[PDB]
Amino acid sequence: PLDPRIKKLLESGFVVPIGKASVDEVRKIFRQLASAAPKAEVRKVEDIKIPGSETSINARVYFPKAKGPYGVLVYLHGGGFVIGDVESYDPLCRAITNACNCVVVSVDYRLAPEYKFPSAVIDSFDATNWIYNNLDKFDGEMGIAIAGDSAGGNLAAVVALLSKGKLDLKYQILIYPAVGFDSVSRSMIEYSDGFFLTREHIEWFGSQYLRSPADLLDFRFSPIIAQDLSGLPPALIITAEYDPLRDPEEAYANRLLQAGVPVTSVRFNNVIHGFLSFFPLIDQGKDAIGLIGSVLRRTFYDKS
Amino acid sequence: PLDPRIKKLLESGFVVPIGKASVDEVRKIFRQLASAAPKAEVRKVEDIKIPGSETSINARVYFPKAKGPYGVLVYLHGGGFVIGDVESYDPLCRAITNACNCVVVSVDYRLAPEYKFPSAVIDSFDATNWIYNNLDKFDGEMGIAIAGDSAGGNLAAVVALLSKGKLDLKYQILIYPAVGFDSVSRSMIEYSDGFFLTREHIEWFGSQYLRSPADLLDFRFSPIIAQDLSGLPPALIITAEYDPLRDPEEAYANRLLQAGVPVTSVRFNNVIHGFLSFFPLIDQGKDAIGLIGSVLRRTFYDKS
Amino acid sequence: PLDPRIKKLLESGFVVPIGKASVDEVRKIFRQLASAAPKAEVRKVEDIKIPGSETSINARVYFPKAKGPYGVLVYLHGGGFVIGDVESYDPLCRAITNACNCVVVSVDYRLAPEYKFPSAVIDSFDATNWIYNNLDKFDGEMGIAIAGDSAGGNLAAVVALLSKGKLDLKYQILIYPAVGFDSVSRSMIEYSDGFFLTREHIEWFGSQYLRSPADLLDFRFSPIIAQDLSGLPPALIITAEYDPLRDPEEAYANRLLQAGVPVTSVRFNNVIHGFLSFFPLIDQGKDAIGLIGSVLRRTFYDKS
Amino acid sequence: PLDPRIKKLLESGFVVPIGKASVDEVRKIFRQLASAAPKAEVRKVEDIKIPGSETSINARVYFPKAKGPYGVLVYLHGGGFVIGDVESYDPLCRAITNACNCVVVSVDYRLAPEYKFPSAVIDSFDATNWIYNNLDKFDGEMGIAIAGDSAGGNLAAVVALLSKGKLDLKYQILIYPAVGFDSVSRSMIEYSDGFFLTREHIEWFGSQYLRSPADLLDFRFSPIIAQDLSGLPPALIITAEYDPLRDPEEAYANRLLQAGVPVTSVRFNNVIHGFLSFFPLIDQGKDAIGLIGSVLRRTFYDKS
């Protein structure tokens, strides 16, 4: 079952009313839930502007207390392509920075409904490309990895596909990613209601971001249908037991492994979608951050 | 685990080499596996020609020994839209006829690759419509129901959708139906190999029947994406534990139930896709036929 | 998920308050829930007294409208070894009689807490033995089979074990049986609350029937630990998707199959423990009765 | 499915022939598989003798390169209560030492069949008690935690129960622990063969360690039946997807959570029982060690 702490939380009015309030109001509610966590100190934080192909892309750079040289983690926030932003994810990014002893660059990709698919993908890819070619500005020569949660994990997976034979990503961290259109899985049907992220929210986010049903078949929305997954960076894929998105994420892990990509696929039992964002209230979220920290310290530094 | 009888069978060379032999050779091998079962006597068998909108449609009519009046079951064979035919399914149709005490009309819908989607759907619908308007010719006034296995179960489900507010179907029997595009489910990933129907076969059948990826999003191929499942006939949905197709079929059951359609969804444990076709070698197949017989005698006759 | 009809029912106060009211009151509430179903006509009903080794055993005999000769189904009711009786199960037994065209003998085995384990087992075995040696009194020469639901299914399975090389049982029908001590399965943990039969009820029933923890290891309470399951009668095992007892029943099916016993193991999706008792309110219960009818008409009569 | 790397490994003759070779030969084969991994440097290693209530208990103490003060992890090796020892687990203990920046004390508890249950429990508890009262000898004032894998994880869980209101354990790390008698779970039935640890091995180990079937009901063998799990130390429970032992471990996690104990329960997908012991050949094993390191650095030091 759910961790009783989580069951109590959901019963006690822990909700974002996606599809039942204006886009402004749902953004505001999410800001308050996410941005409430403590902001751990880091060494230095910098806001920068990345020159993207279609827009100037805001990003926030977090430097760790450890001395360089560093690896650089490009981080793409979640929020169903519609909500979230760099500043609401500041507590989570600072926690990751400290766990990984690495530079984290959190990207403000364009959001729907104002900017439809594939705008978020273009910005996420353009930001990763620029960071790769400018690692020297971050004392970042230990290399680049890409990470994101939920919608951001979808973007991370897709950027890893788009980067093949262009950039040299060390690693992809996919934190309960959306991996594409799912009208069929058991987890999607079983956990459609009552577990924080609902089927109605998933459909509402889709209705804002996608332009037509053809986009469902586009690998830049559904990377699980990509023709060829070989040669992608090694993956850590974190899933949550009581999450409608769980089964397709475990399928994507298996497909990567089948294509010879190294994958550590881990299900956090007893918890729900989005749990890292609520690490003060959901202890397992801290341990998932610690797991991200382990994998990145190993890839970048060959350290424990 | 698999029923040891089935494990022994698969180990002992029980295979159709889909995608690894010519269309002619795979059709021939399937004919031999299916057509090998005993042909139970029925009262009378008749081959008829149904005037379809695009072709003359062959069908075989089986009359039960019980006296009329009858319900009429329209039966659509499986074979991935490419293999099978009325004559290979003659043993299974005779078994159903005897179990249900009903008239069975088995439909020879056009096959791929010669005829692509949606030719099989058009023929299956046209046949059902004609049978409905001609029930009197079968002493068939107790009404019409639709059934099929695998690809035929897909066609049965889709005909039920297309019939809403045109015909009065009493019931839909979906025997491990294909219910649409699935790149994500656990059963599909878990049972992709070694359980008679493989992912490679599913992809090969798709490559023969579909015209483009857009067809994946067509409700006449993927009925699980239909906009509105309400008002469909009550369903019996039979699934098999070790079948890649299992999870999406259980999702379709749940979606029907959510739309207020009565559904009896039953998983036959320990068995594989296609098991009713092999009822002499797989005892559970006999019991699945007996379950079909119960549901149809109740719907048509209000008899035990 | 649950069939919405069932979810509505449970939400609407469908409960037996096991462990929270006196034994008299819980028996009375169960009588009212079970005995409410319509009593289908049969040909003749007779109450008899079977001379058991420890008690005179009441049984109710139901004769079908079909002409003889008959098979005889020994039926053992459920109720956690504590509640239920022949008369509350009269609607279900009449439904089975009509489905199977067979004689049903429903046994009033001694109940806990008045009579502890193994009293129910002794009576169930003694009744089966007497019926076997007296089949001629029922025009019952087509043979004997044993069936029960829940606690009664436990007793049926155990009688099948105790009968090996004494009686010639044709078949065992185990309808969501209790198959022994389970402190570990996923279904038990997952469906411990909210699905009609709860962990607290299971523990309360155990506390009334068992004498000490050693009884947990007795094969006459936990048949899944029996040393040797070979040579038992072919089984139909019915399970329900949302039932804490589900996983150990599927394990018992697998163990039988591994011991070379023919088993048809079927999970009724979307439904709860006890669903056949509520066949007027839960349509799938009718279809499960129809499946029992198919299997028994085949074993006894070699008829469809 | 299994990680293809693991499938290749198992196919390529990766086996301990438990129950099919002498106790000496199975011990020798395990020594060679486990002891083959690289021995990472640590600061200092010491072999000590702990005065137990029934025997002098050998233990190996590993000091980390980081400066003190330290927490102390008591480590209990796996091997089904029969095989393994401190020296075969030296590579894994050194890896843990480095990940946790902590003192690890690996305990040589008495083995079956020479010493039956509960000898291993008595030694594991006596060692933990002595280490707790002698933390000063290890510069170990940051406290004590207990960890073990498989049989050792069973012993760790049981020591945590036995320590309540005697010692102050900070944490219990249970790495695919055996949590007691399981004749019923789906994982046990499903993964009984072909996944390195088999049902036959589990039964053979039991037959060497236990004295009678009554021991199955003893909470010091089956901690999942303990009367009261409240007030135990926070747990990290690691399970593996393709492991017969998986389901009862997830049940034990849930029971702890229900008793208000903090638990992080994580399933490593695609891998088998014992995978941390094979961290050079199974990459996920390294990441599981990194997760142990995160949780211990947090509990002992409040560090990332």
Short mmCIF file of C-alpha atoms in Angstrom, two decimals, chain C residues 55-264:
data_model
loop_
_atom_site.label_atom_id
_atom_site.label_comp_id
_atom_site.label_asym_id
_atom_site.label_seq_id
_atom_site.Cartn_x
_atom_site.Cartn_y
_atom_site.Cartn_z
CA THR C 55 -21.65 -36.36 14.92
CA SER C 56 -24.83 -36.79 12.97
CA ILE C 57 -24.23 -34.51 9.94
CA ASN C 58 -27.17 -32.57 8.42
CA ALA C 59 -27.12 -32.20 4.61
CA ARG C 60 -29.52 -30.84 2.06
CA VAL C 61 -29.91 -32.74 -1.22
CA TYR C 62 -30.97 -30.91 -4.42
CA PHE C 63 -32.21 -32.92 -7.43
CA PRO C 64 -32.13 -31.37 -10.90
CA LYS C 65 -35.03 -31.28 -13.37
CA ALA C 66 -32.96 -33.27 -15.91
CA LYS C 67 -33.46 -37.03 -15.82
CA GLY C 68 -30.86 -39.34 -14.25
CA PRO C 69 -28.45 -40.90 -13.90
CA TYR C 70 -26.57 -38.06 -12.15
CA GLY C 71 -23.20 -37.14 -10.81
CA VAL C 72 -23.27 -35.95 -7.19
CA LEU C 73 -21.52 -32.74 -6.15
CA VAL C 74 -20.65 -32.56 -2.43
CA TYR C 75 -20.83 -28.84 -1.56
CA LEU C 76 -19.16 -27.24 1.46
CA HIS C 77 -20.23 -23.70 2.27
CA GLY C 78 -17.98 -20.78 3.16
CA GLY C 79 -18.08 -18.39 6.12
CA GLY C 80 -14.53 -18.55 7.59
CA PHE C 81 -15.30 -21.83 9.49
CA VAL C 82 -17.58 -19.78 11.77
CA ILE C 83 -20.53 -18.40 9.80
CA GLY C 84 -22.77 -19.61 6.97
CA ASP C 85 -24.79 -22.86 6.97
CA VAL C 86 -26.72 -24.98 4.44
CA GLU C 87 -29.82 -22.76 4.48
CA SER C 88 -28.05 -19.46 3.75
CA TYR C 89 -26.34 -21.20 0.78
CA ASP C 90 -29.62 -22.59 -0.56
CA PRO C 91 -29.86 -19.96 -3.37
CA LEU C 92 -26.29 -20.64 -4.51
CA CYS C 93 -26.70 -24.44 -4.32
CA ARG C 94 -29.95 -24.32 -6.34
CA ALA C 95 -28.17 -22.16 -8.99
CA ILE C 96 -25.33 -24.76 -9.15
CA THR C 97 -27.80 -27.67 -9.34
CA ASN C 98 -29.46 -26.08 -12.36
CA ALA C 99 -26.16 -25.19 -14.08
CA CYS C 100 -24.63 -28.69 -13.60
CA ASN C 101 -27.74 -30.85 -14.14
CA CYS C 102 -26.42 -32.83 -11.19
CA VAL C 103 -27.38 -33.76 -7.61
CA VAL C 104 -25.88 -31.34 -5.11
CA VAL C 105 -25.42 -32.35 -1.50
CA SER C 106 -24.73 -29.37 0.72
CA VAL C 107 -23.06 -30.34 4.02
CA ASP C 108 -23.67 -28.77 7.44
CA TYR C 109 -20.19 -29.33 8.92
CA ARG C 110 -19.55 -28.37 12.52
CA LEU C 111 -18.64 -24.70 13.05
CA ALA C 112 -16.22 -22.84 15.23
CA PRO C 113 -15.87 -21.50 17.85
CA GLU C 114 -18.20 -24.24 19.25
CA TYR C 115 -16.19 -26.94 17.41
CA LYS C 116 -12.54 -26.22 16.68
CA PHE C 117 -10.30 -27.54 13.92
CA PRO C 118 -10.24 -30.21 12.73
CA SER C 119 -14.00 -30.80 13.35
CA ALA C 120 -15.07 -29.21 10.05
CA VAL C 121 -12.53 -31.37 8.16
CA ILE C 122 -13.67 -34.60 9.85
CA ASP C 123 -17.33 -33.88 9.03
CA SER C 124 -16.58 -32.85 5.45
CA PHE C 125 -14.54 -36.00 4.86
CA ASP C 126 -17.09 -38.31 6.62
CA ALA C 127 -19.93 -36.80 4.55
CA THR C 128 -18.02 -37.28 1.28
CA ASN C 129 -17.17 -40.87 2.19
CA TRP C 130 -20.80 -41.68 3.01
CA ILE C 131 -22.12 -40.04 -0.16
CA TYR C 132 -19.60 -41.99 -2.25
CA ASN C 133 -20.74 -45.32 -0.71
CA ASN C 134 -24.39 -44.34 -1.11
CA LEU C 135 -24.49 -42.85 -4.59
CA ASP C 136 -27.17 -45.39 -5.53
CA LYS C 137 -29.62 -43.58 -3.21
CA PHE C 138 -29.34 -40.47 -5.46
CA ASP C 139 -29.41 -42.25 -8.80
CA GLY C 140 -25.86 -40.93 -8.62
CA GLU C 141 -23.80 -43.52 -10.45
CA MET C 142 -22.05 -40.95 -12.72
CA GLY C 143 -19.75 -40.37 -9.71
CA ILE C 144 -18.82 -37.82 -7.02
CA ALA C 145 -17.08 -34.43 -7.15
CA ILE C 146 -16.36 -32.02 -4.31
CA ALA C 147 -16.78 -28.22 -4.31
CA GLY C 148 -16.72 -25.34 -1.81
CA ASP C 149 -16.20 -21.59 -1.52
CA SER C 150 -13.71 -19.81 0.75
CA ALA C 151 -13.48 -21.84 4.04
CA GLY C 152 -15.51 -24.52 2.20
CA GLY C 153 -13.01 -24.51 -0.62
CA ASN C 154 -10.27 -25.12 1.90
CA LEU C 155 -12.31 -28.09 3.19
CA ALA C 156 -12.90 -29.35 -0.40
CA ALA C 157 -9.16 -29.23 -1.21
CA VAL C 158 -8.34 -31.01 2.07
CA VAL C 159 -11.02 -33.70 1.53
CA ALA C 160 -9.52 -34.30 -1.94
CA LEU C 161 -6.12 -34.88 -0.24
CA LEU C 162 -7.65 -37.15 2.46
CA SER C 163 -9.60 -39.18 -0.21
CA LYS C 164 -6.55 -40.22 -2.26
CA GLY C 165 -6.59 -44.02 -2.49
CA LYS C 166 -9.88 -44.25 -0.59
CA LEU C 167 -12.63 -42.72 -2.78
CA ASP C 168 -12.71 -41.91 -6.44
CA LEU C 169 -13.43 -38.17 -6.68
CA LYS C 170 -13.98 -37.06 -10.32
CA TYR C 171 -13.20 -33.43 -9.77
CA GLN C 172 -12.56 -30.68 -7.17
CA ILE C 173 -14.07 -27.23 -7.61
CA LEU C 174 -12.28 -24.69 -5.40
CA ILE C 175 -14.08 -21.35 -5.38
CA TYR C 176 -11.68 -18.68 -3.94
CA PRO C 177 -10.56 -21.29 -1.36
CA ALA C 178 -8.54 -20.42 1.76
CA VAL C 179 -5.39 -22.60 1.08
CA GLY C 180 -3.48 -22.01 4.27
CA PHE C 181 -1.43 -19.67 6.38
CA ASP C 182 -0.25 -16.57 4.45
CA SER C 183 1.76 -13.88 6.21
CA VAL C 184 3.60 -12.80 2.97
CA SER C 185 1.71 -12.62 -0.34
CA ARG C 186 1.24 -9.39 -2.31
CA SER C 187 -2.53 -9.86 -2.65
CA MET C 188 -2.90 -10.41 1.10
CA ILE C 189 -1.00 -7.14 1.87
CA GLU C 190 -2.50 -5.15 -0.99
CA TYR C 191 -6.15 -6.09 -0.42
CA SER C 192 -6.04 -6.35 3.42
CA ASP C 193 -8.67 -3.59 3.68
CA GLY C 194 -11.64 -2.30 1.79
CA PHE C 195 -12.58 -5.37 -0.32
CA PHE C 196 -15.27 -7.00 1.84
CA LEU C 197 -13.03 -9.79 3.23
CA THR C 198 -10.30 -8.05 5.30
CA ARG C 199 -7.09 -9.19 7.06
CA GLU C 200 -8.82 -8.52 10.36
CA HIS C 201 -11.66 -10.90 9.41
CA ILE C 202 -9.20 -13.57 8.29
CA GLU C 203 -7.32 -13.28 11.63
CA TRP C 204 -10.55 -13.30 13.61
CA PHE C 205 -11.86 -16.44 11.86
CA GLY C 206 -8.45 -18.11 12.48
CA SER C 207 -8.60 -17.18 16.15
CA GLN C 208 -11.97 -18.97 16.48
CA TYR C 209 -11.22 -22.15 14.47
CA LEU C 210 -7.57 -22.95 15.16
CA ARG C 211 -6.39 -24.34 18.49
CA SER C 212 -2.77 -23.22 18.43
CA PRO C 213 -0.20 -21.95 15.97
CA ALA C 214 0.90 -25.56 15.26
CA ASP C 215 -2.42 -26.01 13.36
CA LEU C 216 -1.11 -23.52 10.78
CA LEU C 217 1.42 -26.14 9.71
CA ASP C 218 -1.17 -28.92 9.55
CA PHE C 219 -1.93 -29.89 5.90
CA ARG C 220 -5.64 -30.18 6.90
CA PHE C 221 -5.59 -26.38 7.41
CA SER C 222 -2.84 -25.47 4.86
CA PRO C 223 -3.09 -27.95 2.01
CA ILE C 224 -0.44 -26.07 0.07
CA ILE C 225 2.12 -27.61 2.43
CA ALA C 226 1.00 -31.18 1.76
CA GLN C 227 3.96 -33.46 1.00
CA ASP C 228 2.56 -34.88 -2.20
CA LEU C 229 -0.15 -33.41 -4.39
CA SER C 230 0.08 -36.02 -7.16
CA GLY C 231 -2.90 -38.18 -8.09
CA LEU C 232 -5.51 -35.64 -6.86
CA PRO C 233 -8.69 -35.10 -8.91
CA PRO C 234 -8.62 -32.47 -11.76
CA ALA C 235 -9.40 -29.02 -10.34
CA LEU C 236 -11.26 -25.89 -11.37
CA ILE C 237 -9.90 -23.06 -9.23
CA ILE C 238 -11.78 -19.75 -9.39
CA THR C 239 -10.05 -16.63 -7.96
CA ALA C 240 -11.02 -12.98 -7.79
CA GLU C 241 -8.72 -10.13 -8.75
CA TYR C 242 -9.36 -7.92 -5.64
CA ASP C 243 -9.19 -10.63 -2.94
CA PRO C 244 -6.46 -10.94 -0.30
CA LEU C 245 -6.67 -14.73 -0.75
CA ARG C 246 -5.92 -14.61 -4.48
CA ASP C 247 -2.18 -15.14 -4.66
CA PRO C 248 -2.00 -18.29 -2.48
CA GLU C 249 -4.85 -19.82 -4.51
CA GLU C 250 -2.91 -19.24 -7.76
CA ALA C 251 0.14 -20.79 -6.02
CA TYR C 252 -1.92 -23.87 -5.11
CA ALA C 253 -3.08 -24.14 -8.80
CA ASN C 254 0.59 -24.04 -9.89
CA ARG C 255 1.59 -26.62 -7.32
CA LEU C 256 -1.14 -28.97 -8.47
CA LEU C 257 -0.10 -28.51 -12.15
CA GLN C 258 3.50 -29.21 -11.12
CA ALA C 259 2.37 -32.47 -9.53
CA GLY C 260 0.69 -33.47 -12.84
CA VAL C 261 -2.85 -32.73 -11.72
CA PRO C 262 -5.03 -31.15 -14.46
CA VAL C 263 -6.06 -27.64 -13.31
CA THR C 264 -8.10 -24.89 -14.90
#
